[PDB]
Design a protein around this nucleic acid. Structure first.
Ligand SMILES: [Mg+2]
Ligand SMILES: [Zn+2]
Ligand SMILES: [Zn+2]
Ligand SMILES: [Zn+2]
Ligand SMILES: [Zn+2]
Lengths: 49, 49, 64, 49, 66, 111, 48, 85, 1157
RNA sequence: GUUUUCGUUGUUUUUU
């Protein structure tokens, strides 16, 4: 009985399913990164991150 | 300005009074003068500062 | 890892301060006690909620 | 104009109150439902002022 | 205590009106008309008498050493 | 739901009888060894939403400080009622105000 | 040097003795007690 | 605020759903996040059960210690995790 | 009966102050002190037994002393020459005496030799100056007219050695309440259920207990609970102590804990506790378990171990519940429910316990503070009888018994606590609270009144936090929300509200009877199944009953408190949601009188006031139409006292407008609750006035509700330090500082609580004329421009008075110094000041033009050995001028002449003088201009003062504009204008009336440049305002020092403008100079402007170990025999000190004038 | 007689 509960409590937390450990969550974030223009000037670009 | 009392910011307001007057939004200008409840709320902000 | 305790308890036999040693062996859940001047022995039952002060108290109860 | 702006903001606040109190308020990213309610009402009332 | 000899804001002779002012007060009289009777035209002179606080009566009701 | 022995009154420790291979709830201090109504030993749900309706007091209808409303009532049908919310202090506690009235006392949702 | 812990005025002219002077006196009287611990009967723990 | 400003590649930086898959593959997931409930049984028989909650399931999967290490998982949390049980 | 208006509410407040006033709490506290508290403290252990068991054949020769009644005497000061006189406070102040009276007791004796009345002086008690036994209590005003006391001076303090000390009440947490807190996660403890379980009566600490919850979720094993009982050396599991406390089976432990049996999670969470306590299966083993860790001695063995564990489970465990036998079952039930509350809080099913709500806090007034100190001092009084009746019992002499009673026992503790400020004993200087008693300020009259109504939270900056300093919603209407100190003490040291009263302490037993009157169900009856939803009832925090029909009992208690059988201050609270109920009668719970809106919906008065114009008329009579006082309204059930804990359970109407639940577009009105969804509102009460949420200082500001709250706080702070007139008999008082205005003026703008404050009679400030513009350019940056004509006429001219106290002293018994004229022959070490002002007795005559560098009180002191006398005079302050107001000659207590010389000066404003408005508008004078240069009006009228427009964009004082407008209107119309906050006045109407006054509605008026008479293009807003002079002047800070006295140790310039202090050069100033490249400048600041000594150090050892003699030109390094390799060093003396202690700590800092390389 | 001689501990409150 006791060992079953011990293993249950342990493996409720020590089964890594997916994901990068040490990263609880990620955010889907924009970045208006500037990139030059072929004609010679510049322009901003929405790049996801 | 949160509900300082039990589910209320003042005894003049009610429980879960999510409306602005019971949570610290000023409905007056400095010309008009402020109601006692919201006067106490501005006292909150001033003492905070 | 066993942990010897250099207790300051004084036994009633040789009247030597700094003589009684209380050692607890929770691997077998059984205590132990000795002396360094008259070299006596003592034993008391230790549960999951037992302390060396409990050992000395039970020794006081048993000897007296 | 000031009076009606404040009144309109209060009505928007009451709408947000109703949505939150019936869970009709859509969840903001990284912003829990009750705290989303509080924050959006804060934004609304700052817009009022 | 004691009305000023000269009006702070203006400078008019005002001191010799206090007893007269009390006289006017005694007959359950309004204040402003009484002040006008006291030739108090400038509202500086007017509130100087209106809002003066004399305090010697409590001081004098103390029995002095001599 | 856990329970204690009648005379031992200590914990009814769940354990197996290999001879029968069935779940028990046996107190260890005494010979009390009861059968298990269900071979379930320990239930520990990781999402908890129970208890918000078990702890309801009768005289909540006679509480003067509660807000009034134009909100509806399935039971008492009073056109001037009070609104409270789930008792959970969890961060993810949805702000689902459980309306209630003078005579109803029920933990009902008007969402 | 006495300059370091001078007669410091506890009241205008009346000087209270410096804390350093007090402690030096205490230490030195204890030291003389230790110096007396030998020629006299000292039953073990008194020296301690 | 431990927070890493991962810059996705240009073609992913102009993408969202593949970026979403990368995001899910970065978000650490254990059953602790997705475990809806846990109720331990001592199942009387090692190769079957006498409970309605897993009778058909273990009848379909089974085709040792009878003590049972049982737990329930959240389907919605699985699909948000983009995993299956 | 009719509607309730504002003036009727004012009349209600008039009844309130005519019976209570504002000192009633202090008066009743100190009266309770010497009417119930003192006697109980005396008789708290009324049995003193001695014996001689031996022979006398065998005998118990039993010296047994029984205690008896105390005696109170009227103040009598007993001169040191047997010319005993009854003491008057004026004489006490003049001779520096203590307002203290003698007390006596009856410690009778009863001798019981077995074969087997007396009136001693306990001590002298300082008395609060308006208790019922004060010297001038029955004496009427004409008698007071003979004893020279200020009628407005309203006592409430203590007089000790001529100094007036006030005991600041100390706010502390109310005991006997569950306090569950969330312990830090990186700790074995998760939730700490705390209760300061201490005897309700006396409100003194007996013990406390904190139950700690172990473990985590999926971590730290089971949710075990092991708490450390008072005086045990280990956390013992709670189930084990339940076994030890009587209920050994665990189902009883749950019946004490479990009360919602429908829950399984709490069962499975308490399972690990059962598992760990399972090693304990009976009361004997549990008690032995506790005793082993019980911190008791060794060799006590199992029997006495169990007995001591049982005692400590009995006494000091829930002592507020019981310390005797029989209620250990009640102990089990109470501990079970308290553990249950701990577990429910741990589950977070309830909001975690709040740490600021006053309902869990009380205020210890002067009464209970003195009670505690007297407890201490008397506990060291009863014992010195034992420690003297032992040295004489062996002799068995005819002991006088009047020599073993060291009566000054209770004199010195109180003297030190009230004088130094530490409430305890001087021996225990450490761990003592400082500031509970402080010198009364009479700078202004309010500097006393408000000073007498402080509160303090003595937590300390141990952990900074904002919660002790931040205003909270519960502070609404109960405290002044604008009066706070400056930075270090800001937020702390809080003031009451206007209508507050403090519970003086009523017996709890009547409340126990009132509660038990309703069929209370005992705690033993409290069961999870039976009482599944029943109401748990508590008294003062002690849980004392259960009930299932609580509506009837709460209604009866409410109506009965309305009646008066319940003490009208006793708090009744009904926790409907958490099936509970609680009554509080402990000392320190503060109540406000609320108008009683009918809350039981059975009449139209529901939503209206029980108090009506009938009651208002009866109060206006001042009596009853067959008396109707304030207590008449309170006990008539139309007004009742309410605390904060009650307040959070009641819904209160703000103004008489929203009492009845109600069903356009004005920009000069305030806002009530919208009432849009909540179509109904049954407000159980309404404040007498919302303007009564203010404080004593706050009742001064004209419309404090039209200006920024920070500026309101600045007003509150500056109000106490504003110049004015403090007391009518300022002259007979010999005080360190006295300030009296030449011409006090009642403000044009007034509140209505003003009327009650009598501000017409003691006004602080003058109504002077101000115009707004930028004319001189000097008005910038907190500077104002002044009319010189008003100053010449004496506007804000004032009188300052400074009292120097001097006395002869006793070096021995006959060795005495004398007040005599110092001369060049008898007196040595003279001073450059002129001694001539002294005439015969070292006393200048009253009325002489005194100045600095001139001796006013001559004193000569013996030299320890013909020409053995030193000047010990105390001349007038160097930069101080004036004329001697008064010279008082008296003696001390015993035999030495004590002189009090007050000097008088006239103060007149000058450039740089500090002033402030009633709207936070503070600044100094920038420049003063005469009448001709400043612009005039069409009628040729100039202002008294000019201000900076830049304040309005920044400081934003609309109320100042309203005040100026109302001031113009009143001055023109000739009446006193009202500015009470939360009133219905509208500025537009005032503008219309100004139009009626034949003046511009917005107050503008053409100024004509004083230099040219040309119409200034803009029309200037120009009119009167009420301003106040402030304590800060310019000439008290002007201070230059090129070279002066140096500190005795540092050999550096002294600190302090009093003694020619130097400018302390801060380290940041050093750093900025370093960044400025100021090498030589900073060097000479540290070399010539600071310490600089030259020494002769060795070149071998490199130390200052050199006997040096410049005249002999010999420099021998005794350390190294070095004489030729000796170098001179011109370095700061502080460096020498540093080297010195480095040497003294056996450290060798070898200075070297060379480079080792 | 050029010259020429006060201080600290602790306590409270303060000052942009
Ligand atoms: Mg400054
Ligand atoms: Zn031995
Ligand atoms: Zn005038
Ligand atoms: Zn059992
Ligand atoms: Zn040397």
């Amino acid at each position: 009985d006791q060992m079953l509960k011990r293993i249950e409590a342990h493996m409720l937390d020590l089964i890594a399913l997916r994901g990068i450990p040490g990263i609880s969550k990620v955010y889907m974030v924009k970045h208006k990164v500037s990139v030059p223009d072929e004609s010679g000037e510049y322009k901003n670009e929405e790049l996801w991150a | 300005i949160a509900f300082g009392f039990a589910d209320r910011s003042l005894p003049h307001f009610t429980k879960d009074d999510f409306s602005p007057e019971s949570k610290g939004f000023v409905e007056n200008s400095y010309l008009r003068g402020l109601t006692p409840q919201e006067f106490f709320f501005h006292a909150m902000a001033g003492r905070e500062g | 890892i066993k942990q010897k305790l250099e207790t300051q308890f004084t036994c009633l036999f040789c009247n030597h301060d700094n003589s009684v040693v209380c050692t607890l062996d929770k691997k077998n859940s059984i205590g132990l006690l000795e002396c360094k001047k008259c070299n006596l022995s003592f034993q008391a039952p230790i549960n999951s909620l037992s302390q060396p002060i409990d050992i000395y108290s039970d020794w006081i109860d048993a000897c007296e | 104009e000031i009076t009606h702006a404040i009144s309109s903001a209060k009505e928007q606040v009451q709408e947000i109150i109703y949505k939150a109190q019936h869970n009709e308020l859509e969840l903001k990213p990284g912003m829990t439902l009750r705290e989303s309610f509080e924050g959006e009402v804060s934004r609304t009332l700052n817009d009022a002022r | 205590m004691i009305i000023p000899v000269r009006c702070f804001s203006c400078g008019k002779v005002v001191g010799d009106k206090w007893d007269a002012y009390l006289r006017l007060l005694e007959e359950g009289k309004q204040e402003g008309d009484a002040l006008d009777e006291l030739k108090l035209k400038r509202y500086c002179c007017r509130r100087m008498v209106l809002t003066h606080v004399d305090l010697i009566e409590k001081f004098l009701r103390y029995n002095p050493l001599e | 739901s856990f329970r204690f022995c009648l005379e031992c009154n200590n914990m009814l420790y769940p354990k197996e009888d290999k001879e029968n291979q069935r779940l028990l709830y046996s107190c260890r201090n005494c010979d009390y060894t009861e059968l298990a109504e269900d071979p379930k030993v320990y239930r520990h749900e990781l999402i908890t939403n129970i208890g918000e309706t078990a702890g309801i007091v009768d005289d909540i209808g006679q509480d003067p400080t509660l807000p009034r409303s134009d909100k509806e009532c399935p039971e008492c049908h009073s056109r001037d009622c009070v609104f409270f919310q789930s008792q959970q202090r969890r961060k993810d506690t949805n702000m689902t105000l459980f309306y209630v009235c003078l005579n109803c006392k029920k933990t009902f949702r008007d969402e | 040097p006495p300059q370091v812990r001078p007669s410091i005025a506890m009241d205008e002219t009346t000087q209270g003795q410096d804390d350093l002077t007090h402690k030096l006196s205490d230490i030195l009287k204890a030291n003389i007690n230790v110096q007396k611990l030998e020629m006299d009967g000292s039953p073990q723990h008194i020296i301690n | 605020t431990p927070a890493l400003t991962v810059y996705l590649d240009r073609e992913i930086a102009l993408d969202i759903e593949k970026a979403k898959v990368i995001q899910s593959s970065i978000e650490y997931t254990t059953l602790k996040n997705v475990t809806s409930a846990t109720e331990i049984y001592y199942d009387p028989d090692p190769t079957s059960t006498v409970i309605e909650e897993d009778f058909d399931t273990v009848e379909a999967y089974f085709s040792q210690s009878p003590w049972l290490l049982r737990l329930e998982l959240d389907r919605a949390r699985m699909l948000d995790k983009q995993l299956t049980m | 009966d009719d509607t309730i208006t504002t003036e009727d509410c004012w009349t209600v407040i008039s009844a309130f102050f005519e019976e209570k006033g504002l000192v009633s709490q202090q008066l009743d506290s100190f009266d309770e002190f010497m009417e119930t508290s003192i006697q109980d403290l005396v008789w708290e252990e009324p049995r003193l037994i001695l014996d001689q068991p031996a022979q006398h054949d065998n005998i118990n020769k039993r010296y047994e002393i029984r205690f008896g009644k105390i005696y109170l005497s009227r103040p009598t000061m007993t001169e040191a020459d047997g010319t005993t006189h009854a003491m008057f406070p004026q004489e006490a102040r003049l001779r520096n005496l203590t307002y203290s009276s003698p007390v006596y007791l009856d410690m009778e004796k009863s001798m019981f030799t077995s074969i087997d009345g007396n009136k001693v002086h306990i001590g002298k008690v300082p008395i609060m100056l308006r208790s019922k036994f004060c010297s001038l209590r029955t004496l009427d005003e004409v008698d007071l007219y003979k004893m020279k006391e200020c009628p407005y001076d309203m006592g409430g303090y203590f007089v000790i050695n001529g100094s007036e000390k006030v005991l600041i009440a100390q706010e502390r947490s109310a005991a006997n309440i569950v306090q569950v807190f969330k312990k830090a996660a990186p700790s074995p403890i998760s939730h700490v259920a705390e209760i300061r379980s201490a005897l309700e009566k006396g409100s003194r600490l007996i013990s406390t207990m904190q139950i700690k919850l172990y473990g985590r979720e999926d971590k730290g094993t089971g949710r075990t609970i092991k708490a450390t009982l008072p005086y045990v050396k280990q956390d013992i599991p709670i189930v084990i102590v339940f076994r030890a406390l009587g209920v050994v089976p665990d189902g009883e432990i749950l019946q004490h804990i479990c009360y919602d049996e429908n829950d399984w999670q709490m069962l499975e969470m308490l399972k690990p506790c059962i598992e760990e306590g399972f090693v304990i299966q009976d009361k004997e083993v549990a008690l032995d378990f506790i005793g082993r860790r019980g911190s008791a001695a060794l060799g006590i063995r199992r029997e006495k171990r169990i007995q001591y564990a049982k005692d400590i489970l009995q006494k000091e465990l829930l002592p507020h519940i019981t310390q005797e036998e029989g209620f250990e079952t009640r102990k089990t039930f109470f501990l079970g429910y308290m553990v249950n509350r701990l577990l429910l809080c741990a589950l977070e099913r309830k909001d975690q316990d709040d740490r600021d709500h006053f309902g869990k806090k009380r205020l210890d007034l002067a009464g209970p503070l003195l009670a505690n100190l007297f407890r201490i001092l008397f506990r060291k009084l009863t014992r010195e009888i034992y420690r003297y009746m032992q040295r004489c019992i062996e002799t068995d002499r005819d002991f006088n018994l009047n020599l073993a009673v060291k009566s000054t026992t209770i004199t010195s503790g109180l003297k030190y606590s009230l004088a130094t400020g530490n409430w305890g004993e001087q021996k225990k200087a450490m761990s003592s609270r400082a500031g509970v008693s402080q010198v009364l300020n009479r700078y202004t009259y309010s500097s006393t009144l408000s000073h007498l109504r402080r509160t303090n939270t003595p937590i300390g900056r141990d952990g900074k936090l904002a919660k002790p300093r931040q205003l909270h919603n519960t502070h609404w209407g109960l405290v002044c929300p604008a009066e706070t100190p400056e930075g270090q003490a800001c937020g702390l040291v809080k003031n009451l509200s206007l209508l507050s009263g403090i519970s003086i302490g009523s017996p709890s037993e009547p409340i126990i009877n009132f509660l038990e009157e309703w069929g209370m169900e005992p705690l033993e009856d409290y069961d999870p199944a039976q009482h599944t939803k029943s109401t748990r009832i508590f008294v003062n925090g002690v849980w004392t009953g259960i009930h299932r029909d609580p509506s009837m009992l709460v209604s009866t208690m409410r109506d009965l408190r309305r009646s008066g059988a319940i003490s009208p201050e006793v708090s009744i609270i009904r926790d409907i949601r958490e099936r509970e109920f609680k009554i509080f009668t402990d000392v320190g719970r503060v109540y406000r009188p609320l108008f009683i809106v009918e809350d039981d919906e059975s009449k139209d008065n529901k939503g209206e006031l029980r108090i009506t114009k009938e009651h208002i008329r009866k109060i206006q009579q001042g009596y009853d139409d067959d008396v109707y006082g304030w207590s008449s309204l309170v006990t008539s059930g139309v007004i009742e006292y309410v605390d904060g804990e009650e307040e959070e359970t009641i819904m209160i109407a703000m103004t008489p407008e929203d009492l009845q639940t109600r069903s356009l577009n004005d920009t000069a009105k305030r806002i009530k609750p919208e009432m849009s969804t909540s179509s109904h509102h049954t407000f159980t009460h309404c404040e007498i006035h919302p303007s009564m949420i203010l404080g004593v200082a706050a009742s001064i500001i004209p419309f404090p509700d039209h200006n920024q709250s920070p500026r309101n706080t600045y007003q509150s702070a500056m109000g106490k330090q504003a110049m004015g007139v403090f007391l009518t008999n300022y002259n007979v008082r010999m005080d360190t500082m006295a300030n009296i205005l030449y011409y006090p003026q009642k403000p044009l703008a007034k509140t209505q609580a003003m009327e009650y404050l009598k501000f017409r009679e003691l006004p602080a400030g003058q109504n002077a004329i101000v115009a707004i513009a930028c004319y001189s350019g000097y008005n910038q940056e907190d500077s104002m421009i002044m009319n010189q004509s008003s100053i010449d006429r004496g506007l804000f001219r004032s009188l300052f008075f400074r009292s120097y106290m001097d006395q002869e002293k006793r070096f021995g018994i006959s060795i005495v110094e004398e007040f005599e004229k110092p001369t060049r022959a008898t007196t040595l070490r003279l001073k450059h000041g002129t001694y001539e002002k002294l005439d015969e007795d070292g006393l200048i005559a009253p009325g002489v033009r005194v100045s600095g560098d001139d001796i006013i009180i001559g004193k000569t002191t013996p030299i320890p050995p013909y020409h053995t006398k030193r000047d010990a005079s105390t001349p007038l302050r160097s930069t101080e001028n004036g004329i001697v107001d008064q010279v008082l000659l008296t003696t001390n207590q015993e035999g030495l002449k004590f002189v009090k010389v007050r000097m008088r000066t006239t103060k007149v404003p000058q450039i740089g003088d500090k002033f402030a408005s009633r709207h936070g508008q503070k600044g100094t004078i920038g420049v003063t201009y005469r009448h001709e240069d400043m612009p005039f009006s069409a009628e040729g009228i100039v202002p008294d003062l000019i201000i900076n427009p830049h304040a309005i964009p920044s400081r934003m004082t609309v109320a100042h504009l309203i005040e100026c407008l109302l001031s113009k209107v009143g001055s023109i119309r000739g009446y006193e204008g009202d500015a009470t906050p939360f009133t219905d006045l509208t500025v537009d109407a005032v503008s219309n009336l100004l139009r009626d006054n034949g003046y511009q509605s917005r107050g503008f008026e053409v100024m004509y440049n004083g230099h040219t008479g040309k119409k200034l293009m803009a029309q200037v807003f120009f009119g009167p305002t009420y301003y106040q002079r402030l304590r800060h002047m310019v000439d008290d800070k002007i201070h230059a020092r090129a070279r002066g006295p140096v500190q005795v140790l540092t050999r550096q310039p002294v600190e302090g403008r009093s003694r020619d202090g130097g400018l302390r050069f801060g380290e940041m100033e050093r750093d900025c100079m370093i960044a400025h490249g100021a090498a030589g400048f900073l060097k000479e600041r540290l070399m010539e402007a600071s310490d600089a000594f030259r020494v002769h150090v060795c070149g071998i050892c490199g130390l200052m170990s050199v006997i040096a003699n410049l005249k002999k030109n010999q420099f021998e390094c005794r350390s190294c025999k070095n004489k030729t390799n000796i170098y001179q060093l011109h370095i700061p003396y502080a460096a020498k000190l540093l080297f010195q202690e480095l040497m003294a700590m056996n450290i060798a800092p070898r200075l070297y004038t060379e480079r080792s390389g």
